[PDB]
Structure formats: structure tokens, C-alpha cells
Amino acid sequence: STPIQQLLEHFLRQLQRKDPHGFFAFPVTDAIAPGYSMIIKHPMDFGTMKDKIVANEYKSVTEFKADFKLMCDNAMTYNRPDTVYYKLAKKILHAGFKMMSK
Numbered sequence: 306s307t308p309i310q311q312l313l314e315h316f317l318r319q320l321q322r323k324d325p326h327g328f329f330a331f332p333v334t335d336a337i338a339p340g341y342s343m344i345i346k347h348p349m350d351f352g353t354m355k356d357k358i359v360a361n362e363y364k365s366v367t368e369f370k371a372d373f374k375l376m377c378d379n380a381m382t383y384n385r386p387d388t389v390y391y392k393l394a395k396k397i398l399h400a401g402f403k404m405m406s407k
């Protein structure tokens with residue numbers, strides 16, 4: 306409800322439109338991605354980011370952007386480059402960093 310919450314909710318809504326399949330909508334579990342929890346130490350996803358906005362855990366755009374980058378970096382580390390997840394992570398990271406610099 307704070308100004309920062311309002312702005313981050315705006316960014317998050319526009320970012321989620323760039324992931325229409327919801328590959329980033331909720332945590333990647335091992336049942337979806339074998340061995341994921343043994344490769345990725347600090348998982349992140351849009352659903353957790355929403356939860357953190359609501360809990361007022363972000364105090365700046367820079368902190369929100371860092372979680373967004375973590376989410377996309379995780380996908381590029383776990384997934385090979387020829388996969389849809391690696392490619393989407395690269396594409397939305399660019400979109401989001403452009404959007405949060407405007």
C-alpha cells in the first residue's frame with residue numbers, strides 16, 4: 306500500500322505479462338525440474354516476489370530488481386542454452402531491466 310509497494314506491484318504485473326506460460330509464476334520444484342534443489346541454492350519466482358511485496362520486504366526498486374535477476378540467473382544456470390527456459394530468462398531479464406530504468 307506504500308508508494309514502493311504500489312510501484313513494485315506495477316512492475317510485477319507488467320513483468321508477468323512477459324511470461325504467459327507461467328514458467329516463472331511459482332517455485333520450480335524437483336518434480337518439475339529433476340535435481341533442481343541440489344543445483345540452485347536461492348530459488349526465486351514471481352509468486353514469492355508478490356509475497357515479498359505484500360509483506361513489505363522490498364524497500365527499494367534495486368532490491369526488487371535483484372530478486373528478479375536472481376530468478377532469471379537461476380534459470381540460466383540450471384537450464385542449458387537451447388532450452389525455452391534459458392531463452393525466456395534472457396529475454397525477460399532484458400525487458401525488466403529496460404522497464405525499471407525508464
Ligand SMILES: CC(=O)c1cc(-c2cc(C(=O)NC3CC3)ccc2C)c2ncccn12
Pocket residue numbers: 327328329330331332333337338379380383384390
Ligand atoms: C524456471 C524454470 O527453470 C522452469 C520452469 C518450468 C516449468 C515448465 C512448465 C511446462 O509446462 N513446460 C512445458 C510446456 C513446455 C510449467 C511450469 C514450470 C514452472 C521448468 N520445467 C523444466 C525445467 C525448468 N523449468
